Design a protein around this ligand. Structure first.
Ligand SMILES: Cn1ncc2cc(Nc3nccc(N(CCCO)c4cccc5[nH]ncc45)n3)ccc21
Length: 265
């Protein structure tokens, strides 16, 4: 737990999200803070942020947002190291001259964070461009672990009871049809994230209902190649969107395909 006296929040909002400065043992660290009311809150939304904190305290990777801690004071606060450029989708909407090599670099960093998550046997379950936060224009981090789950030792998937309120346009068919979430389900989501990144933050499956996306995908249809997208990156999207989970690659295989140097498998 953090000391409220060492935290300063900027009033201008960044639910309530603020930028702040947290005094560490020597230096100040710039932080982003999710703030909830102490009494008139939503207990389920608080449970989700406590669940996020429980996951993020177990993770340690350069391509995943680091948690500073929780502060219990005039409000309930979840404090993270700030990736100040913010969400990747908004960034690419506002910066349309980011070069192909730079977009590949960023999505490669996300694949390295997700290869670590997969090795760690956690599923993310909300992997979208809005949840990739930029430290700089050359350094991406994965965020938003509110739906994340630690997999059981004897299974490679998390089974949800039924469909909740989900980011269905980012979900694999086995998630929608059987409520089963694996690291290969996150690979499907990563394919959608790549499409967003090469479409300068446009929303996927524009104008379609979730049920219409399910029917489209079952028929073997997929979103088309974004204008100007490198062919090799659209081909990797299609491999991420392999319907059968058993033939879809995992993140170790996807991460290799985003490297810009020679390597062996
Ligand atoms: C303009 N804008 N909008 C959102 C946003 C976010 C950041 N950077 C950032 N960096 C680290 C964490 C973080 N937040 C706020 C996300 C708001 O949607 C978090 C706080 C608490 C828990 C969290 N989990 N995942 C992220 C996150 N935000 C910069 C500019 C931004």
């Amino acid at each position: 737990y953090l000391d409220r006296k060492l935290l300063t929040l900027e009033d201008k909002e960044l639910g309530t999200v603020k930028k702040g400065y947290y005094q560490m043992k020597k230096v100040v660290k710039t932080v982003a803070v999710k703030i909830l009311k102490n009494e008139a809150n939503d207990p389920a939304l608080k449970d989700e942020l406590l669940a996020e904190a429980n996951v993020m305290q177990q993770l340690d990777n350069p391509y995943i947002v680091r948690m500073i801690g929780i502060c219990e004071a005039e409000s309930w606060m979840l404090v993270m190291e700030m990736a100040e450029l913010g969400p990747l989708n908004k960034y690419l909407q506002q910066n349309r001259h980011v070069k192909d090599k730079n977009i590949i670099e960023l999505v490669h960093q996300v694949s390295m964070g997700m290869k670590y998550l997969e090795e760690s046997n956690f599923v993310h379950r909300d992997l979208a461009a809005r949840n990739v936060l930029l430290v700089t224009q050359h350094y991406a981090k994965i965020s938003d672990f509110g739906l994340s789950k630690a997999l059981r030792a004897d299974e490679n998937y998390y089974k949800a009871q039924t469909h909740g309120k989900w980011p269905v346009k980012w979900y694999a068919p086995e998630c929608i049809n059987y409520y089963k979430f694996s690291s290969k389900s996150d690979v499907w989501s990563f394919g959608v994230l790549m499409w967003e990144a090469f479409s300068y933050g446009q929303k996927p499956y524009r104008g379609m209902k979730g049920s219409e996306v399910t029917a489209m995908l079952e028929k073997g249809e997929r979103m088309g190649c974004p204008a100007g997208c490198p062919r090799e990156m659209y081909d990797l999207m299609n491999l991420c969107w392999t319907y059968d989970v058993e033939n879809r690659p995992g993140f170790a295989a996807v991460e290799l395909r985003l490297r810009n140097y020679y390597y062996d498998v």
